Amino acid sequence: AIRFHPTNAALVACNAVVDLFDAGGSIEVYTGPQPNDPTVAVSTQTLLVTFAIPAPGYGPAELVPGQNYVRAPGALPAVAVPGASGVAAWARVKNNAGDVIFDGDVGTSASSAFVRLSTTNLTAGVGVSVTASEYRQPT
Amino acid sequence: AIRFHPTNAALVACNAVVDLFDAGGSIEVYTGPQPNDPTVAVSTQTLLVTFAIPAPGYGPAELVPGQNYVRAPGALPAVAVPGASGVAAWARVKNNAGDVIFDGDVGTSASSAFVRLSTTNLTAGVGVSVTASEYRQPT
Amino acid sequence: NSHFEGIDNALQTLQEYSPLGRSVAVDFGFSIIGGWSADETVGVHAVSHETVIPSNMAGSIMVTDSSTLDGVLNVMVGTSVVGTVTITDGAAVFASSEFNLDPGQLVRIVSTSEGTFEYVGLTLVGHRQVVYVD
Amino acid sequence: PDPRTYGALTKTGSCSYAFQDFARSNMAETVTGAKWLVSNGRDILNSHFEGIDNALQTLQEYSPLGRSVAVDFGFSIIGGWSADETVGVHAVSHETVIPSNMAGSIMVTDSSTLDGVLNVMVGTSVVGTVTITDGAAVFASSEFNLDPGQLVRIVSTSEGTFEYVGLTLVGHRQVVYVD
Amino acid sequence: ITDGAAVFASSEFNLDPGQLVRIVSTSEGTFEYVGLTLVGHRQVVYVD
Amino acid sequence: RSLKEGIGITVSDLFVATGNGGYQSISQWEATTFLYETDAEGTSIDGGRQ
């Protein structure tokens, strides 16, 4: 039952991964099915919309009082118009170097998924604004 | 929920922690009860035995084919002679400088706790062989 | 005995889950007999009111008598794929993400490969708000 | 106490005050200035918790009485139909009401060129009709009560071809507990 | 069934998730439509 | 009697007191057999004094 010390480790773990977004990146959301793992390249999904992460992507790190995690808010991208129509199902992230960093999920606005949406039903030519999206490292 | 890229991300994060043990470290085990978290200060529990982590203690990180985590091989401390006999309850780690990194729990060999014992209670002055020392980091 | 309120309030909170701002499960079913063929559109349903499908289609179920049937089913909406079902030797698992459903939307199930059996059953579940018309 | 009349009261100034068993008329009233509460209220805390009617009113506007819309009758059709062919039927269990113009009901299909008309039959005589054009349809009918045992029928007057057509109606039923 | 005369016969029983109910006929039938419906009692536990 | 229908989250426990006196704990003076969880991952066992 490992319990990271807040200052000693938690901040280091957050900074090690988050700092690599200082060059910016992109966010891609594709229709399902979600790929098995990030190593698998897109084979039959369709691009719906894309975003970019203004530099810095993340940092500085900070602790979250009264919790088991440390959070570090990042940048606030602008609006993008969908590149297609349908229902958003899955998302992917790429750094300024194009590296597939990680894979998450999307759900309703009350969901705990990676990206919260007013409604997955999206039609081409109607955009939305990125309210917020941050990171948390459980302790 | 998020799935990280093993090569691009996982190894980086895994290495960005255990590298602190390059110049060795120290371990401390106490009888119950266990403190809430590393920030807490040892106040009443009784130390059992002091283990010295060989320098370096761990690393570098490696992938685990056919698995959902990465692995970080660890060093092997020499058997330490216990003081007074005591029932192991919880563990703690202090780096070469003494800074607490994380808390740990105790349990039998089959137990999922990271501290595996041949027998629950250790008699005074009985050196216990070191099972193994490997750290895992989920993909 | 005054200061009844100190315990009357306790009596009141008990029934404080009246059907307002809450949802109940709604079940959608299917029925297929004597196998199917590949690429077969085996079932659709038109939504009548707003519904939300929990991630991974939690609560959904499949049943059959083959004990050996294999293949894959695609949970399909219009031109978008929302989810699918894995089948292995008569045992099936569900895999998909959360999504919304709206009136005017249409659900569809498409077979991927040919199947042989006597009968198969399928049922999904969704969340609907409780509403009144009076 | 005799001849059993209530004396007048009046306070307009802003001076602070405090009453304790100041018996007077129990009717409405109005006083000015900052009142102080001295009565303890542990026997037999400001006086009027009559706001409880608010909480109770909350638990009356919401209650399981009145109709609910959760009664839906969904039909799935594959391939196509022929002229004068039945595509669905259902046995009504509990008395049900039907909205006017079959509102809430909806139909969808892939065949963007499909054009046809449907008729709703209960017992012997038609009861409702839906027209279909360019893969879309329009509902048009009045209301009519349905009772246990009654059978609802639908037929396609003219032949039609498509991949799949979904027709869903709406009803209203009274919520009822059971054992 | 006897000239549209339906008679039901069974005892009380339970149903559990993981179970599928199955309907099996006996002999050939001739008609234009057949309507059958069963009534089951379910608790009103909310799903959040 | 405190019957805990089902096997739900909250275990049963008891107390007693007069209008002004202190509280007493029945649980403090009973012979309780126990079912300590194995703690193996996923092998939850929720139980206690019913």
XYZ file of C-alpha atoms in Angstrom:
689
model
C 0.000 0.000 0.000
C 2.269 2.747 -1.297
C 1.315 6.265 -0.169
C 3.444 8.938 -1.832
C 4.581 11.779 0.363
C 3.003 14.955 -1.087
C 6.113 17.101 -1.443
C 8.780 14.440 -1.922
C 7.232 12.332 -4.686
C 3.761 13.386 -5.853
C 4.997 16.684 -7.276
C 7.937 14.969 -8.981
C 5.719 12.386 -10.673
C 3.324 15.057 -11.932
C 6.090 17.349 -13.184
C 7.998 14.564 -14.951
C 5.110 13.723 -17.284
C 3.301 17.067 -17.486
C 6.348 19.204 -18.275
C 6.738 17.566 -21.696
C 3.684 19.528 -22.907
C 5.574 22.822 -22.596
C 5.943 22.583 -26.387
C 2.171 22.288 -26.848
C 0.193 19.553 -28.491
C -3.107 18.474 -29.987
C -6.256 16.609 -28.962
C -8.031 14.290 -31.405
C -11.469 12.753 -30.860
C -12.547 9.847 -33.058
C -15.704 7.797 -33.355
C -15.737 4.373 -31.754
C -14.720 1.728 -31.259
C -11.873 2.939 -29.070
C -8.492 1.394 -29.962
C -7.311 -1.416 -27.723
C -4.167 0.471 -26.692
C -2.287 3.620 -27.748
C 0.223 1.484 -29.649
C -2.488 0.560 -32.165
C -2.825 3.087 -34.975
C -6.194 4.303 -36.219
C -7.571 1.843 -38.759
C -11.320 2.459 -39.107
C -12.187 5.420 -36.860
C -13.229 8.794 -38.274
C -11.854 12.137 -37.131
C -14.522 14.437 -35.689
C -12.698 17.486 -34.297
C -9.236 18.508 -33.114
C -7.736 20.917 -30.587
C -4.308 22.314 -29.745
C -2.719 22.973 -26.354
C -1.033 26.408 -26.159
C 2.322 26.319 -24.419
C 2.803 25.623 -21.594
C 0.565 22.565 -21.565
C 1.022 22.070 -17.824
C 2.942 23.346 -14.829
C 3.633 24.508 -12.230
C 2.452 21.648 -10.014
C 0.523 22.219 -6.799
C -0.951 20.116 -4.019
C -4.678 19.697 -3.391
C -5.474 20.197 0.309
C -7.840 17.697 1.874
C -7.470 15.065 -0.849
C -5.240 12.246 -2.100
C -3.947 13.943 -5.255
C -2.029 16.934 -6.593
C -3.542 18.984 -9.415
C -1.860 21.327 -11.894
C -4.078 23.340 -14.253
C -2.801 23.781 -17.791
C -3.641 25.873 -20.848
C -7.107 26.857 -22.112
C -7.416 26.125 -25.853
C -9.807 27.928 -28.177
C -12.879 26.681 -30.061
C -12.755 24.281 -33.004
C -15.431 23.450 -35.574
C -16.158 19.730 -36.093
C -14.550 18.024 -39.063
C -17.494 15.634 -39.430
C -20.836 14.695 -37.865
C -21.929 11.935 -35.519
C -21.400 10.986 -31.870
C -18.092 11.578 -30.115
C -16.845 8.409 -28.445
C -13.070 8.450 -27.925
C -10.152 10.874 -27.640
C -6.383 10.883 -28.157
C -3.601 13.339 -27.304
C -0.448 14.256 -29.217
C 2.446 16.456 -28.134
C 4.227 18.999 -30.310
C 6.355 16.050 -31.455
C 3.218 14.145 -32.471
C 3.767 11.402 -29.900
C 0.602 9.606 -28.819
C 0.899 10.387 -25.117
C -2.144 8.656 -23.633
C -5.710 7.560 -24.306
C -8.783 8.527 -22.304
C -12.568 8.476 -22.660
C -15.451 10.912 -23.044
C -18.891 11.008 -21.497
C -21.740 13.218 -20.403
C -21.039 16.516 -18.667
C -21.492 14.861 -15.256
C -19.144 12.007 -16.189
C -15.727 11.277 -14.718
C -14.331 10.512 -18.182
C -11.383 12.358 -19.699
C -13.467 14.968 -21.550
C -16.904 16.130 -20.429
C -19.354 17.051 -23.188
C -22.742 18.736 -23.253
C -23.855 15.948 -25.592
C -21.875 13.421 -27.612
C -24.205 14.050 -30.568
C -22.199 16.412 -32.793
C -22.934 17.778 -36.269
C -20.370 19.291 -38.622
C -20.240 23.076 -38.561
C -21.160 23.585 -34.886
C -18.338 24.198 -32.419
C -18.043 24.391 -28.638
C -15.724 26.058 -26.133
C -13.183 24.234 -23.960
C -14.335 25.094 -20.441
C -11.457 23.385 -18.622
C -9.396 20.213 -18.324
C -6.676 19.448 -15.773
C -4.663 16.614 -14.228
C -4.673 14.737 -10.923
C -2.185 12.248 -9.474
C -3.706 10.037 -6.744
C -1.613 9.574 -3.614
C -9.172 5.492 -16.554
C -6.582 7.104 -18.808
C -4.273 4.704 -20.643
C -0.708 5.954 -21.027
C 1.712 5.250 -23.841
C 4.225 2.755 -22.381
C 7.381 3.814 -24.208
C 6.607 7.516 -24.586
C 5.138 8.015 -21.107
C 5.174 5.046 -18.732
C 8.931 4.483 -18.586
C 9.534 8.208 -18.090
C 7.195 8.386 -15.099
C 8.444 5.128 -13.585
C 12.074 6.235 -13.793
C 11.251 9.729 -12.505
C 10.665 8.310 -8.998
C 12.974 5.411 -8.161
C 15.970 7.375 -9.463
C 15.984 9.152 -6.089
C 17.518 5.962 -4.642
C 20.712 6.269 -6.701
C 22.721 7.000 -3.539
C 20.903 4.431 -1.408
C 18.202 4.793 1.191
C 16.891 3.547 4.510
C 13.806 1.581 5.534
C 11.989 1.584 8.866
C 9.337 -0.834 10.132
C 7.181 -0.249 13.205
C 4.521 -2.046 15.192
C 0.933 -0.873 14.947
C -0.942 1.334 14.640
C 0.035 2.821 11.268
C 0.126 6.620 10.771
C -2.281 8.284 8.381
C 0.349 9.251 5.811
C 4.059 10.049 5.302
C 3.638 13.666 6.423
C 2.757 12.319 9.870
C 5.645 12.090 12.343
C 6.680 8.919 14.168
C 5.352 9.515 17.678
C 4.513 6.290 19.529
C 5.203 3.169 17.450
C 8.238 0.975 18.085
C 10.925 0.547 15.444
C 11.748 -3.088 14.668
C 14.764 -3.181 12.333
C 16.666 -0.827 10.028
C 17.294 -1.859 6.412
C 19.820 -0.014 4.241
C 18.971 0.217 0.544
C 22.027 -0.458 -1.661
C 23.058 2.440 -3.878
C 21.473 2.557 -6.454
C 18.239 1.111 -5.085
C 16.325 0.695 -8.340
C 16.184 1.373 -12.051
C 16.413 1.903 -14.884
C 12.820 1.236 -15.957
C 11.838 -1.602 -18.290
C 8.726 -2.711 -20.137
C 6.735 -5.832 -19.273
C 5.601 -7.616 -22.461
C 2.294 -9.403 -22.020
C 1.311 -7.103 -19.160
C -0.352 -3.796 -18.291
C 2.428 -2.313 -16.133
C 6.129 -1.574 -16.289
C 8.774 -2.918 -13.910
C 11.770 -1.379 -12.142
C 14.265 -3.926 -10.766
C 15.517 -3.110 -7.287
C 18.639 -3.599 -5.198
C 19.049 -6.260 -2.498
C 19.712 -5.040 1.061
C 21.654 -7.330 3.363
C 19.869 -9.120 6.188
C 19.573 -6.958 9.298
C 19.552 -8.246 12.873
C 16.240 -7.248 14.513
C 16.094 -5.597 17.895
C 13.371 -6.612 20.327
C 10.760 -8.975 18.926
C 7.745 -7.155 17.537
C 4.685 -7.765 15.374
C 5.182 -5.974 12.065
C 2.328 -3.579 11.288
C 3.471 -1.010 8.721
C 6.586 0.130 6.891
C 8.166 3.416 5.873
C 11.016 4.450 3.584
C 13.584 7.205 4.072
C 16.024 8.119 1.316
C 19.770 8.536 1.778
C 19.104 11.988 3.244
C 16.310 10.540 5.406
C 13.348 12.161 3.651
C 10.211 10.035 3.828
C 9.015 8.929 0.393
C 5.941 6.783 0.987
C 4.135 4.624 3.519
C 3.923 0.851 3.355
C 1.839 -1.974 4.761
C 2.796 -5.399 6.078
C 1.389 -8.828 5.359
C 2.196 -12.454 4.735
C 4.042 -13.627 1.633
C 0.863 -14.322 -0.341
C -0.519 -10.950 0.752
C -0.630 -8.178 -1.835
C 1.234 -5.928 0.612
C 4.680 -4.953 -0.652
C 6.271 -6.234 2.583
C 6.207 -10.037 2.397
C 7.238 -12.057 5.457
C 7.944 -15.760 5.825
C 6.171 -15.553 9.189
C 4.072 -12.789 10.708
C 5.977 -12.235 13.966
C 9.775 -12.001 13.999
C 11.812 -13.019 17.036
C 14.449 -10.648 18.383
C 17.813 -10.843 16.662
C 16.645 -13.259 13.946
C 17.891 -12.182 10.526
C 15.199 -12.493 7.853
C 16.211 -13.085 4.244
C 15.152 -10.472 1.697
C 12.523 -11.925 -0.639
C 12.837 -9.467 -3.531
C 12.679 -5.774 -4.403
C 10.770 -4.810 -7.553
C 8.606 -1.737 -8.128
C 5.690 -1.723 -10.562
C 4.019 1.185 -12.345
C 0.682 0.671 -14.143
C 0.666 1.322 -17.876
C -41.617 17.566 25.101
C -41.301 20.749 23.073
C -38.511 20.974 20.526
C -40.369 18.285 18.585
C -38.763 19.754 15.479
C -35.440 18.287 16.568
C -36.908 14.864 15.825
C -39.757 15.803 13.473
C -37.117 16.884 10.970
C -35.505 13.464 11.369
C -38.835 11.892 10.429
C -39.027 14.171 7.396
C -35.615 13.453 5.856
C -36.555 9.770 5.645
C -38.947 10.164 2.716
C -36.688 12.761 1.103
C -36.099 10.829 -2.097
C -39.357 11.603 -3.874
C -39.212 11.125 -7.654
C -37.817 14.529 -8.582
C -34.501 15.142 -10.293
C -33.875 11.406 -10.565
C -33.782 8.644 -13.156
C -34.769 4.990 -13.453
C -33.500 2.210 -15.678
C -35.169 1.589 -19.041
C -34.680 -1.709 -20.856
C -34.403 -2.329 -24.600
C -34.547 -5.919 -25.827
C -33.997 -7.998 -28.946
C -34.896 -11.475 -30.170
C -33.222 -13.588 -32.865
C -34.086 -17.150 -33.874
C -32.239 -19.804 -35.849
C -28.916 -18.034 -36.320
C -28.142 -15.112 -38.583
C -25.994 -14.224 -41.580
C -23.021 -11.891 -41.755
C -23.681 -8.170 -42.204
C -27.264 -8.722 -41.038
C -29.187 -5.789 -39.562
C -30.935 -7.769 -36.834
C -32.567 -5.068 -34.706
C -33.309 -1.344 -34.453
C -35.289 0.905 -32.134
C -36.304 4.565 -32.312
C -35.846 6.601 -29.137
C -38.993 8.250 -27.794
C -37.444 10.360 -25.017
C -34.062 11.522 -23.782
C -31.942 8.681 -22.443
C -28.353 8.187 -21.299
C -26.465 4.910 -21.711
C -23.901 4.232 -18.951
C -20.369 3.517 -20.112
C -19.525 -0.062 -21.122
C -23.291 -0.619 -21.441
C -23.269 -1.691 -17.805
C -26.308 -3.821 -17.049
C -26.662 -5.169 -20.583
C -26.896 -8.927 -21.048
C -26.872 -11.673 -23.671
C -28.155 -15.247 -23.506
C -28.178 -18.199 -25.886
C -28.183 -21.985 -26.095
C -25.297 -22.561 -28.520
C -22.636 -22.593 -25.782
C -20.220 -22.373 -28.727
C -21.281 -19.404 -30.879
C -18.548 -16.920 -31.773
C -18.435 -13.577 -33.533
C -19.000 -9.911 -32.776
C -22.002 -7.580 -32.698
C -21.775 -3.851 -33.394
C -23.877 -1.355 -31.454
C -24.631 1.095 -34.229
C -26.279 4.499 -34.566
C -26.759 5.927 -38.046
C -23.262 6.221 -39.497
C -21.543 6.172 -36.080
C -20.391 3.187 -34.018
C -21.085 3.558 -30.299
C -20.213 0.095 -29.033
C -19.878 -3.597 -29.740
C -20.206 -6.969 -28.022
C -17.650 -9.773 -27.830
C -18.812 -13.398 -27.937
C -16.651 -16.418 -27.094
C -17.990 -19.977 -26.905
C -21.376 -18.855 -25.629
C -19.927 -16.256 -23.237
C -20.164 -12.571 -24.115
C -18.760 -9.317 -22.740
C -19.660 -5.687 -23.411
C -17.287 -2.859 -24.301
C -18.143 0.753 -25.127
C -18.042 4.288 -23.760
C -20.705 6.637 -22.427
C -22.901 8.497 -24.898
C -26.176 10.392 -25.105
C -29.412 9.435 -26.834
C -31.981 11.918 -28.104
C -35.479 11.722 -29.614
C -35.201 11.274 -33.351
C -32.131 9.066 -32.929
C -32.169 5.435 -34.035
C -30.398 2.398 -32.570
C -29.142 -0.409 -34.798
C -27.456 -3.792 -34.362
C -25.415 -5.266 -37.215
C -23.891 -8.722 -37.406
C -20.238 -8.992 -38.390
C -19.950 -12.691 -39.301
C -22.363 -15.541 -39.926
C -23.827 -17.269 -36.885
C -25.339 -20.675 -36.198
C -27.659 -21.481 -33.277
C -31.243 -22.110 -32.207
C -32.032 -18.875 -30.361
C -30.229 -15.851 -28.913
C -31.458 -13.098 -26.599
C -30.085 -9.599 -26.060
C -31.111 -6.691 -23.841
C -29.668 -3.243 -23.144
C -30.396 -0.770 -20.349
C -30.541 3.015 -20.193
C -31.339 5.850 -17.808
C -34.462 7.987 -18.204
C -35.714 10.902 -16.152
C -38.994 10.512 -14.294
C -41.610 12.841 -15.788
C -45.284 13.688 -15.353
C -47.972 14.865 -17.740
C -50.103 16.082 -14.811
C -61.741 39.749 31.838
C -64.892 41.874 31.783
C -66.599 42.898 29.488
C -64.168 40.681 27.616
C -62.471 43.088 25.203
C -58.933 43.471 23.886
C -57.051 46.677 24.572
C -55.296 48.446 21.725
C -51.561 48.279 21.068
C -49.322 50.485 18.952
C -45.567 50.939 18.615
C -44.093 52.951 15.744
C -40.806 54.233 17.159
C -37.506 52.499 16.536
C -36.633 51.860 20.191
C -35.660 48.280 20.961
C -38.020 46.232 23.108
C -38.656 42.766 24.503
C -41.947 41.039 25.311
C -42.491 38.217 27.793
C -46.009 36.801 28.207
C -47.414 40.141 27.030
C -50.833 38.642 26.409
C -52.746 40.496 23.701
C -54.893 39.849 20.648
C -53.930 36.698 18.766
C -54.855 38.333 15.427
C -52.416 39.867 12.961
C -50.263 42.784 14.077
C -47.269 44.918 13.139
C -44.466 46.379 15.267
C -41.419 48.528 14.578
C -37.923 48.284 16.019
C -35.588 45.420 16.813
C -37.483 42.843 18.850
C -35.578 40.628 21.279
C -36.537 37.064 22.181
C -36.316 36.269 25.895
C -38.773 33.393 26.154
C -36.837 30.148 26.348
C -39.202 27.718 24.634
C -38.252 24.488 26.444
C -41.381 23.257 28.228
C -44.700 21.485 27.649
C -35.753 29.433 19.197
C -37.908 31.881 17.242
C -41.612 31.215 17.243
C -42.738 30.566 13.671
C -41.485 27.428 11.998
C -44.725 27.567 9.980
C -42.418 27.424 6.963
C -42.787 23.643 7.256
C -45.651 24.063 4.807
C -42.908 24.837 2.287
C -41.245 21.459 2.741
C -44.586 19.654 2.649
C -45.639 21.604 -0.432
C -42.412 20.371 -1.996
C -43.423 16.765 -1.302
C -46.883 17.272 -2.796
C -46.111 18.798 -6.184
C -44.025 15.639 -6.665
C -45.900 12.445 -5.821
C -46.857 9.238 -7.654
C -50.279 10.443 -8.741
C -51.101 11.277 -12.331
C -50.176 9.727 -15.637
C -46.681 8.800 -16.802
C -45.250 8.738 -20.319
C -42.985 5.707 -19.850
C -45.444 3.554 -21.860
C -43.953 3.186 -25.342
C -44.779 0.644 -28.057
C -41.750 0.093 -30.283
C -41.790 -1.871 -33.528
C -38.800 -2.897 -35.641
C -39.274 -3.899 -39.285
C -36.736 -5.319 -41.740
C -36.746 -5.821 -45.492
C -40.076 -4.333 -46.496
C -43.825 -4.758 -46.569
C -46.468 -5.579 -49.154
C -49.668 -3.738 -49.976
C -52.279 -4.523 -47.315
C -49.914 -6.305 -44.938
C -49.770 -6.268 -41.148
C -46.366 -5.378 -39.699
C -47.159 -5.266 -35.978
C -49.685 -5.847 -33.195
C -49.716 -5.684 -29.412
C -52.045 -6.738 -26.607
C -53.017 -3.900 -24.278
C -52.623 -4.897 -20.628
C -53.767 -1.943 -18.502
C -56.177 0.787 -19.579
C -54.259 3.392 -21.544
C -54.812 6.810 -23.100
C -53.618 7.921 -26.535
C -52.453 11.514 -27.148
C -54.033 13.637 -29.847
C -52.383 13.462 -33.275
C -50.288 10.603 -31.855
C -47.881 13.253 -30.557
C -44.623 11.980 -29.096
C -44.703 9.203 -31.671
C -41.907 9.131 -34.236
C -40.760 7.083 -37.221
C -37.349 6.810 -38.873
C -35.926 4.770 -41.737
C -32.989 4.631 -44.122
C -35.130 4.734 -47.269
C -34.967 8.444 -48.081
C -37.303 7.852 -51.053
C -39.943 5.786 -49.243
C -43.440 7.206 -49.720
C -46.520 5.557 -48.259
C -49.354 5.691 -45.754
C -50.140 3.633 -42.652
C -53.456 3.022 -40.904
C -54.042 2.203 -37.234
C -56.761 -0.376 -36.583
C -58.336 -1.474 -33.305
C -61.030 -4.117 -33.399
C -62.672 -3.583 -36.792
C -62.437 0.093 -37.774
C -59.363 2.223 -38.333
C -58.394 4.589 -35.523
C -55.365 6.514 -36.826
C -53.232 7.100 -39.887
C -49.641 8.097 -40.632
C -48.405 9.322 -44.010
C -44.854 8.645 -45.202
C -42.901 10.749 -47.692
C -39.198 10.953 -48.570
C -38.427 8.669 -45.653
C -40.270 11.060 -43.316
C -43.788 10.798 -41.939
C -46.539 12.924 -40.415
C -48.946 11.850 -37.679
C -52.602 12.880 -37.869
C -55.430 11.517 -35.710
C -57.562 12.213 -32.653
C -57.444 10.541 -29.229
C -59.080 7.308 -28.128
C -58.971 5.297 -24.923
C -57.552 1.780 -24.865
C -58.679 -0.832 -22.354
C -57.386 -4.222 -21.193
C -57.897 -6.916 -23.804
C -58.192 -4.525 -26.741
C -55.851 -5.294 -29.632
C -54.034 -2.545 -31.535
C -53.352 -3.268 -35.201
C -51.342 -1.602 -37.958
C -51.279 -2.398 -41.681
C -49.509 -1.067 -44.766
C -51.981 -0.295 -47.542
C -49.324 -0.201 -50.280
C -46.145 -2.183 -50.822
C -42.895 -0.655 -49.620
C -39.211 -1.525 -49.819
C -36.384 -0.411 -47.539
C -33.711 -1.743 -45.202
C -35.310 -1.001 -41.824
C -38.177 1.143 -40.534
C -38.823 1.974 -36.881
C -42.186 3.206 -35.612
C -42.685 4.145 -31.958
C -45.875 5.521 -30.430
C -46.567 7.111 -27.051
C -49.231 6.590 -24.403
C -50.178 7.794 -20.944
C -50.939 5.418 -18.076
C -51.814 6.107 -14.455
C -49.104 5.125 -11.989
C -50.366 2.384 -9.682
C -48.754 0.333 -6.944
C -49.169 -3.447 -6.805
C -48.247 -6.407 -4.615
C -56.258 -22.236 -26.645
C -59.726 -23.322 -27.770
C -61.380 -21.111 -30.401
C -59.735 -18.010 -28.973
C -60.230 -19.232 -25.395
C -56.936 -18.646 -23.582
C -56.414 -20.316 -20.201
C -53.245 -19.731 -18.183
C -51.891 -22.269 -15.710
C -48.747 -21.989 -13.584
C -47.539 -21.205 -10.070
C -45.670 -18.272 -8.580
C -41.989 -18.086 -9.513
C -39.026 -15.717 -9.528
C -36.815 -14.297 -12.263
C -33.185 -13.303 -11.819
C -30.707 -11.360 -13.962
C -28.769 -13.777 -16.116
C -31.927 -15.729 -16.966
C -33.801 -15.804 -20.269
C -37.451 -16.780 -20.642
C -38.257 -19.045 -23.577
C -41.531 -19.595 -25.436
C -42.072 -22.875 -27.297
C -45.104 -23.812 -29.386
C -46.661 -27.277 -29.698
C -48.377 -27.719 -33.086
C -48.929 -25.771 -36.286
C -51.178 -22.729 -36.184
C -53.144 -20.745 -38.751
C -54.058 -17.073 -38.343
C -53.180 -13.526 -39.385
C -51.825 -12.261 -36.043
C -51.339 -13.590 -32.510
C -50.902 -11.277 -29.524
C -49.463 -12.522 -26.239
C -48.385 -10.491 -23.220
C -47.313 -11.280 -19.659
C -47.462 -9.155 -16.508
C -44.526 -9.046 -14.113
C -43.939 -7.183 -10.869
C -40.750 -5.135 -10.510
C -39.503 -2.971 -7.669
C -38.955 0.733 -8.248
C -35.352 0.982 -7.067
C -33.848 4.080 -8.642
C -30.716 3.888 -10.787
C -29.319 7.204 -9.551
C -33.953 -5.314 18.720
C -32.021 -3.799 15.816
C -32.650 -6.046 12.815
C -30.552 -4.997 9.814
C -32.506 -6.291 6.841
C -30.204 -7.241 4.016
C -26.422 -7.151 4.138
C -26.123 -3.431 3.527
C -23.473 -0.856 4.327
C -24.220 -0.125 7.992
C -23.742 -2.775 10.672
C -25.993 -2.969 13.728
C -25.050 -1.353 17.034
C -26.943 -0.385 20.166
C -27.015 2.269 22.877
C -29.218 3.247 25.812
C -29.672 6.202 28.152
C -32.243 8.025 30.251
C -33.391 11.601 29.729
C -30.282 13.142 31.293
C -27.898 10.281 32.068
C -25.063 9.143 29.836
C -25.032 6.571 27.066
C -24.177 2.890 27.384
C -22.787 0.633 24.658
C -24.154 -2.899 24.445
C -21.616 -3.802 21.762
C -18.823 -3.110 24.254
C -19.868 -6.155 26.328
C -20.626 -8.968 23.876
C -18.665 -11.953 22.560
C -18.255 -11.125 18.863
C -17.054 -13.637 16.308
C -15.406 -12.007 13.313
C -14.873 -12.453 9.580
C -11.802 -10.317 8.877
C -11.449 -9.687 5.157
C -8.704 -11.580 3.350
C -7.930 -8.319 1.478
C -6.980 -10.201 -1.706
C -7.697 -7.875 -4.601
C -11.368 -7.920 -5.566
C -12.299 -10.499 -2.909
C -14.547 -8.214 -0.898
C -16.634 -9.623 1.938
C -19.002 -7.109 3.530
C -20.415 -8.314 6.830
C -20.580 -7.781 10.551
C -22.914 -7.735 13.518
C -26.356 -8.229 11.963
